[PDB]
Design a protein around this nucleic acid. Sequence first.
RNA 1: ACUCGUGAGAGACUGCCGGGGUCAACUCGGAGGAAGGUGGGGAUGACGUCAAGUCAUCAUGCCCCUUAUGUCCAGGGCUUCACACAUGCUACAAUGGCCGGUACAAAGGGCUGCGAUGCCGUGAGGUGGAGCGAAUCCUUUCAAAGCCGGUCUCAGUUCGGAUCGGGGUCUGCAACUCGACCCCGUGAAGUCGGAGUCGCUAGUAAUCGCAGAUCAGCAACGCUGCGGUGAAUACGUUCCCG
Lengths: 99, 126, 60, 116, 155, 82
Amino acid sequence: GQKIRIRLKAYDHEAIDASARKIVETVTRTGASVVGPVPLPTEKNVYCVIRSPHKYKDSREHFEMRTHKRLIDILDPTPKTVDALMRIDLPASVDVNIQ
Amino acid sequence: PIQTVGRRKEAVVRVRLVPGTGQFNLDGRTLENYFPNKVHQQLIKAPLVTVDRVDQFDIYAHLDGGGPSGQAGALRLAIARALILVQPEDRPALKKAGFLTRDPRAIERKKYGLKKARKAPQYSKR
Amino acid sequence: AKKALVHKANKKPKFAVRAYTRCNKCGRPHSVYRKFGLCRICLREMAHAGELPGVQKSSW
Amino acid sequence: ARLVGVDLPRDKRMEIALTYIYGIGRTRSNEILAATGIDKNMRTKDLTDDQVTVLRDYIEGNLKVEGDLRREVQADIRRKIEIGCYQGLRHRRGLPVRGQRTKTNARTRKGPKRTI
Amino acid sequence: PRKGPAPKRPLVNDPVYGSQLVTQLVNKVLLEGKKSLAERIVYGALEQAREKTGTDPVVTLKRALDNVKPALEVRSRRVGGATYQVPVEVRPDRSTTLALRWLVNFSRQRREKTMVERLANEILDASNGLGASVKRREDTHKMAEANRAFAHYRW
Amino acid sequence: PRSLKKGPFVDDHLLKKVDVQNEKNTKQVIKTWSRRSTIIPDFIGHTFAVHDGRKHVPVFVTEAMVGHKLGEFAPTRTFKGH
RNA sequence: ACUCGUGAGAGACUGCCGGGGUCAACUCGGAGGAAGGUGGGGAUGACGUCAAGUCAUCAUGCCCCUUAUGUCCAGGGCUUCACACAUGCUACAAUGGCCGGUACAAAGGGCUGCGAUGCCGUGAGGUGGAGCGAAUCCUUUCAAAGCCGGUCUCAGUUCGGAUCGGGGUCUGCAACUCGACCCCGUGAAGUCGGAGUCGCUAGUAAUCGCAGAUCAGCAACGCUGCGGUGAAUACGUUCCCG
């Protein structure tokens, strides 16, 4: 009747994959249908900084920040899945929200 | 079904083939309406002319990335590989002219502290 | 930065345009990124200290 | 021909020929021509009396050109250079009045170089 | 280039004529990075030559460049703060390169106010031998033969 | 330049002082430390001592210089040639 | 089924052959192959040197003020100008100038933020609001060079843009000194630049546009990136420098 997407983001690949695997296993145990964690574009923020204070501009250093994002789509909204959803433990660096 | 992919310095093309008449479709335009270059014309003719079976295939191209020459080269390579696939006997021909050698040349990074790539600011002795 | 200047920066300005960056860790008014709020020197030093969630050396 | 007592060039487009006056340049030529209705593909060689008469009628009726423009510009300048105005004092010393830079620039204002 | 000679670049065969002289010329006249405009300029000049001489462009350009192809060059060698001019023969490749460079560089001086007719006119003049490229060739040979004395350094 | 929608700029002190003066049938010398304020036609009959950083320059405004700020007629920096 | 988004893996390893080789490293040529010899580029900078730079990022020993060099506040300066140096951008045009049509890039950024349609403006823009905390919506289906058609015909030019005048828009409590942008006008220097000197060896220079950081607005032509088009020669160490 209703399908739910969950956006699922982290810098770390290990933690994000472990969270996805745990959630998929829990859904399989509960008895609900999910498409799977389809990949999404990885956002990258790029910055430049000056290595030396007080002159010598030509020497600089670049910084990055990478955020890997994915979606997990669940069909057939089994009530037990909704009951057991928010109690699932997640890694510190992984953030998941509903849509 | 047959589908082939070509790439040339950030231009990506996908080509589908039909054994139909001697005409081409480039996202809804013919070979003269789109890529209106004689040089590009011979470049795209080079595979078929080398294999000597012009006017035997109708192509349909979907294009992205790059500019005129990049997409022209990408289409050339894609159709060359497609022809090699459908008729492998012509494999020892294009390699003689080196049409199977994909071109690994791209844009070099602009390096900080300079003007661009390898260009450098003017140097004064005083 | 003088402590008086730091406190005046901590004091909210009486006009909207009278506000500036005033880097958090030190207080260097120049080159303060809005993503972090830190001056570039402090940002680089802390990032190389392994105490920021996401920052890393860039190479490409 | 003639253009408010001035000698029109023998071979110039009227959209370019009307630029030769002190008050009409690029856009005003076309605005005057459109409000008048003269075809812009001809030459001064063909410019007959009717175009000339509608032309000076329109230029009399639209704005100020030639000498009066010079004297009104001078009137504004004299208003600004004898009331203590900052722009006037900057005119007096031969320096840019728009708060420009004179450390190395403003060559066309001060003039040619006099090396010291 | 200190260790040894770098491998020579290949020349792409000209698709319309089959000889690389025309593509060399269009590559040299190229500037600001545009192949199409330079190609059309050279092709217009060649077709004006077609309609003005009635002969095949390849052969006429061939013997024109042959008649403007230099044979010897003068090189500077400095000792004790004073220079010496030594004559050295030239390989045909650099000879043709210098001839074509002279043509292109001095094709911006004809006073007929358009580049394509400039090229056509100078190509035809060099075909007739009255072009300024012939003058530079004669000057270069005068310099080479007059200063043939200073060659005992053998270079 | 200045958005005319907000109207000509005049801060309250000298406006109130000139209100007191001209409602008391009196015209005196006004000294102000403001330079950004504009020239008001009601002020044309008065004079203003405007500050340049050290002290005040007195200016007797007329109808010739209307429409400009005070500082447009009171130079600040000093340069006596080379 | 095809790019693509993102994970894992295969593959360039003198692997094979032939000549030079001391049957050696190594060098060239050839075969297959996307690439043939560290495929291309980043990151990483040993021991040492200049009593090099930074007490103004921060802390740091000694000395100094300590009712002041502390300290809040209003205006003004860091943009002042007869000069000289350095780094850049725009031009001296016909490989061009002006007018309409025409088709392909990448990356990036966006909450009191990107902000589309309509309403009215020559153009900044005033009305208000649909899509999005963002592969969803906005940066026009994302640009210019390119190509086509019209014209200008070599002049201080339908080049060039400076200085100057009148009238405005946006933001900011507040635009004169001292923000940007818009309309209109006269249109200065400027004719390929002396002695001398600079960057560069393959997708490089040269040219063209786009994006970001800081930013309410910008002096940004600056810096860090992206993509389009894209050639020349390298004989050889004699000389100049490290």
